[PDB]
Scaffold this active site. Structure first.
Site, PDB file in Angstrom:
ATOM      1  N   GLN A  80       7.446  33.190  43.432  1.00  0.00           N
ATOM      2  CA  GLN A  80       8.747  32.825  42.909  1.00  0.00           C
ATOM      3  C   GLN A  80       9.453  31.915  43.946  1.00  0.00           C
ATOM      4  O   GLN A  80       9.210  32.021  45.147  1.00  0.00           O
ATOM      5  CB  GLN A  80       9.531  34.117  42.751  1.00  0.00           C
ATOM      6  CG  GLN A  80      11.050  33.986  42.417  1.00  0.00           C
ATOM      7  CD  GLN A  80      11.572  35.351  42.047  1.00  0.00           C
ATOM      8  OE1 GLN A  80      11.575  35.732  40.870  1.00  0.00           O
ATOM      9  NE2 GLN A  80      11.983  36.121  43.076  1.00  0.00           N
ATOM     10  N   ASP A  86      25.815  29.355  23.672  1.00  0.00           N
ATOM     11  CA  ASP A  86      25.069  28.139  23.957  1.00  0.00           C
ATOM     12  C   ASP A  86      24.097  27.780  22.808  1.00  0.00           C
ATOM     13  O   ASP A  86      24.342  28.149  21.635  1.00  0.00           O
ATOM     14  CB  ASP A  86      24.299  28.304  25.301  1.00  0.00           C
ATOM     15  CG  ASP A  86      24.237  27.022  26.073  1.00  0.00           C
ATOM     16  OD1 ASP A  86      23.571  26.092  25.560  1.00  0.00           O
ATOM     17  OD2 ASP A  86      24.815  26.865  27.183  1.00  0.00           O
ATOM     18  N   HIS A 116      18.970  23.497  26.617  1.00  0.00           N
ATOM     19  CA  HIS A 116      20.157  23.713  27.439  1.00  0.00           C
ATOM     20  C   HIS A 116      20.479  25.210  27.633  1.00  0.00           C
ATOM     21  O   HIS A 116      20.671  25.619  28.797  1.00  0.00           O
ATOM     22  CB  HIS A 116      21.329  22.955  26.797  1.00  0.00           C
ATOM     23  CG  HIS A 116      22.619  23.030  27.555  1.00  0.00           C
ATOM     24  ND1 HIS A 116      23.513  24.062  27.364  1.00  0.00           N
ATOM     25  CD2 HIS A 116      23.164  22.223  28.501  1.00  0.00           C
ATOM     26  CE1 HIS A 116      24.563  23.871  28.151  1.00  0.00           C
ATOM     27  NE2 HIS A 116      24.380  22.766  28.846  1.00  0.00           N
ATOM     28  N   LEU A 151      14.282  36.268  35.933  1.00  0.00           N
ATOM     29  CA  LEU A 151      13.814  37.596  36.422  1.00  0.00           C
ATOM     30  C   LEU A 151      13.329  37.565  37.876  1.00  0.00           C
ATOM     31  O   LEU A 151      12.831  36.560  38.346  1.00  0.00           O
ATOM     32  CB  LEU A 151      12.688  38.145  35.523  1.00  0.00           C
ATOM     33  CG  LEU A 151      13.085  38.409  34.076  1.00  0.00           C
ATOM     34  CD1 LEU A 151      11.748  38.630  33.291  1.00  0.00           C
ATOM     35  CD2 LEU A 151      14.025  39.633  33.987  1.00  0.00           C
ATOM     36  N   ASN A 165      10.601  38.500  40.174  1.00  0.00           N
ATOM     37  CA  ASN A 165       9.178  38.802  40.053  1.00  0.00           C
ATOM     38  C   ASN A 165       8.433  37.772  40.922  1.00  0.00           C
ATOM     39  O   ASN A 165       9.014  37.198  41.865  1.00  0.00           O
ATOM     40  CB  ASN A 165       8.774  38.736  38.556  1.00  0.00           C
ATOM     41  CG  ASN A 165       9.205  37.414  37.906  1.00  0.00           C
ATOM     42  OD1 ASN A 165       9.400  36.415  38.605  1.00  0.00           O
ATOM     43  ND2 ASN A 165       9.354  37.412  36.582  1.00  0.00           N
ATOM     44  N   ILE A 204       7.106  34.824  39.839  1.00  0.00           N
ATOM     45  CA  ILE A 204       6.941  33.568  39.103  1.00  0.00           C
ATOM     46  C   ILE A 204       8.247  32.804  39.004  1.00  0.00           C
ATOM     47  O   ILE A 204       9.338  33.398  39.105  1.00  0.00           O
ATOM     48  CB  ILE A 204       6.372  33.819  37.662  1.00  0.00           C
ATOM     49  CG1 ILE A 204       7.323  34.652  36.800  1.00  0.00           C
ATOM     50  CG2 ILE A 204       4.950  34.490  37.754  1.00  0.00           C
ATOM     51  CD1 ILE A 204       7.076  34.447  35.223  1.00  0.00           C
ATOM     52  N   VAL A 244      11.645  30.907  38.865  1.00  0.00           N
ATOM     53  CA  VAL A 244      12.844  30.861  39.688  1.00  0.00           C
ATOM     54  C   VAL A 244      13.423  32.274  39.745  1.00  0.00           C
ATOM     55  O   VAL A 244      12.909  33.185  39.102  1.00  0.00           O
ATOM     56  CB  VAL A 244      13.855  29.863  39.107  1.00  0.00           C
ATOM     57  CG1 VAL A 244      13.339  28.413  39.319  1.00  0.00           C
ATOM     58  CG2 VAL A 244      14.169  30.161  37.562  1.00  0.00           C
ATOM     59  N   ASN A 264      32.394  17.106  32.379  1.00  0.00           N
ATOM     60  CA  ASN A 264      31.710  16.053  33.149  1.00  0.00           C
ATOM     61  C   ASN A 264      32.440  14.695  32.967  1.00  0.00           C
ATOM     62  O   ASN A 264      31.792  13.638  32.803  1.00  0.00           O
ATOM     63  CB  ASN A 264      30.250  15.887  32.718  1.00  0.00           C
ATOM     64  CG  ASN A 264      29.427  17.167  32.888  1.00  0.00           C
ATOM     65  OD1 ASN A 264      29.801  18.054  33.681  1.00  0.00           O
ATOM     66  ND2 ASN A 264      28.339  17.267  32.136  1.00  0.00           N
ATOM     67  N   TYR A 293      41.992  26.192  29.319  1.00  0.00           N
ATOM     68  CA  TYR A 293      42.870  27.356  29.065  1.00  0.00           C
ATOM     69  C   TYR A 293      42.996  28.246  30.275  1.00  0.00           C
ATOM     70  O   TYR A 293      41.947  28.581  30.892  1.00  0.00           O
ATOM     71  CB  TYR A 293      42.299  28.162  27.905  1.00  0.00           C
ATOM     72  CG  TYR A 293      42.347  27.426  26.607  1.00  0.00           C
ATOM     73  CD1 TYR A 293      43.543  26.807  26.175  1.00  0.00           C
ATOM     74  CD2 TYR A 293      41.226  27.327  25.811  1.00  0.00           C
ATOM     75  CE1 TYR A 293      43.579  26.113  24.978  1.00  0.00           C
ATOM     76  CE2 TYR A 293      41.246  26.663  24.582  1.00  0.00           C
ATOM     77  CZ  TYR A 293      42.435  26.059  24.169  1.00  0.00           C
ATOM     78  OH  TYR A 293      42.421  25.372  22.950  1.00  0.00           O
ATOM     79  N   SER A 311      27.741  22.278  33.314  1.00  0.00           N
ATOM     80  CA  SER A 311      26.938  23.287  32.591  1.00  0.00           C
ATOM     81  C   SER A 311      26.064  24.157  33.517  1.00  0.00           C
ATOM     82  O   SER A 311      25.797  25.323  33.198  1.00  0.00           O
ATOM     83  CB  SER A 311      25.970  22.671  31.610  1.00  0.00           C
ATOM     84  OG  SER A 311      26.616  22.422  30.346  1.00  0.00           O
TER      85      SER A 311
HETATM   86 CA   LIG Z   1      11.221  34.842  38.678  1.00  0.00          CA
HETATM   87 NA    NA Z   2      41.056  27.679  32.891  1.00  0.00          NA
END
Ligand SMILES: [Ca+2]
Ligand code: NA
Lengths: 281, 63
Positions: free
Chosen positions: A2, A32, A64, A75, A77, A79, A81, A155, A171, A221
């Site tokens: 990882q 999303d 996305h 996760l 583990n 692997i 990220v 952006n 807000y 994002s």
């Molecule tokens: Ca991982």
């Molecule tokens: Na705000």
């Protein structure tokens, strides 16, 4: 093996992980484009689609929502990220279609679903240049109900002395997150204005992509889910802290960067946020 | 050239033509004005926000 993306380190999430806190039992809705639940480095706990023509929230036809989700909760583990809160209970609340767009009512319906399903944190890596009363009521309702609500600042970059933060980030009840890079410089695209609350890494952010892939994306994002994930870490360490207290913990312990018009309160530091006593470093 | 304020109030057709002269590799997506969209930043993309008449309703920009 990882890899830990630099942004996860930069916000000091590993300090929480070493204390034993990883977002366990905290419910995070990624509102999303869906989340690819087949990805081996994600575990999706539940969800719902508010997209009329795309009824499966576990299918992400854009990519996305999957990327955003991996930053929140990829996760722990051997692997891929590592996410900021790799034990969080991750909910796919699909309100955007394949083309990355959604109607205001779809977003609102997702926010309502999240409240009705007792989500602890909402992340909205999404936005529009105008508000609506119904959008504002949905986010205010979520906050009144105890939910930590985090959203991308936008952006739009700079526009003289004008605010360029979009909605719902703009807000007061929503934490609006702008983007910095690995040197803590604001990204040139990052929206600005007095509504900018905090910053997090949003340049060249490695995360999960549909069909068991990974890739580096850019955007506010990408910054927002560092903060939603940080909120889940803080709640796993302090399960009784209210949303009010999680939000203040993050605001009160940033590393201050520049002028607040461009940087808000600065870069989040989840290690300092999750202590009882808060100060800026 | 990364923003096209002179295109506001033009047809979506003229806007696509002009943007592709300035940025021939642009990935153009047309959406109704007043929709919510993803906040990732894509240097190759130019979203167009149209009104109900299919005219440009907001300044197009790269992202
Ligand atoms: Ca991982
Ligand atoms: Na705000």
């Amino acid at each position: 093996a990882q890899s830990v993306p630099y942004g996860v380190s930069q916000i000091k999430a590993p300090a929480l992980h070493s204390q034993g806190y990883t977002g366990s039992n905290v419910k995070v809705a990624v509102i999303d484009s869906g989340i690819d639940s087949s990805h081996p480095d994600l575990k999706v706990a539940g969800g719902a689609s508010m997209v009329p023509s795309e009824t499966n929230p576990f299918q992400d036809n854009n990519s996305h929502g999957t990327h955003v989700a991996g930053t929140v909760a990829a996760l722990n583990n051997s692997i891929g990220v590592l996410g900021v809160a790799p034990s969080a209970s991750l909910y796919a609340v699909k309100v955007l279609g394949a083309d990355g767009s959604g109607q205001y009512s779809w977003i609102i319906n997702g926010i309502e679903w999240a409240i009705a399903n007792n989500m602890d944190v909402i992340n909205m890596s999404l936005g529009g240049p105008s508000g609506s009363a119904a959008l504002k009521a949905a986010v205010d309702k979520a906050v009144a109900s105890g939910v930590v609500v985090v959203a991308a600042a936008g952006n739009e970059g700079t526009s003289g002395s004008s605010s360029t933060v979009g909605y719902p980030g703009k807000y007061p009840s929503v934490i609006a997150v702008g983007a910095v890079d690995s040197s803590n410089q604001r990204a040139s695209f990052s929206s600005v204005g007095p509504e900018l609350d905090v910053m997090a890494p949003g340049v060249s952010i490695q995360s999960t992509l549909p069909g068991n892939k990974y890739g580096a994306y850019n955007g506010t994002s990408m910054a927002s889910p560092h903060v939603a994930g940080a909120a889940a870490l803080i709640l796993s360490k302090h399960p009784n802290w209210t949303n009010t207290q999680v939000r203040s913990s993050l605001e009160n312990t940033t590393t201050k960067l520049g002028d607040s018009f461009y940087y808000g309160k600065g870069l989040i530091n989840v290690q300092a946020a999750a202590q009882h006593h808060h100060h800026h470093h | 050239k990364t923003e096209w304020p002179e295109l506001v109030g033009k047809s979506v057709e003229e806007a696509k033509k002009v943007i592709l002269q300035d940025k021939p590799a642009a990935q153009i997506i047309v959406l109704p004005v007043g929709t919510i969209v993803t906040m990732e930043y894509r240097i190759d993309r130019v979203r167009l926000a149209v009104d109900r008449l299919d005219n440009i309703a907001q300044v197009p920009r790269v992202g």
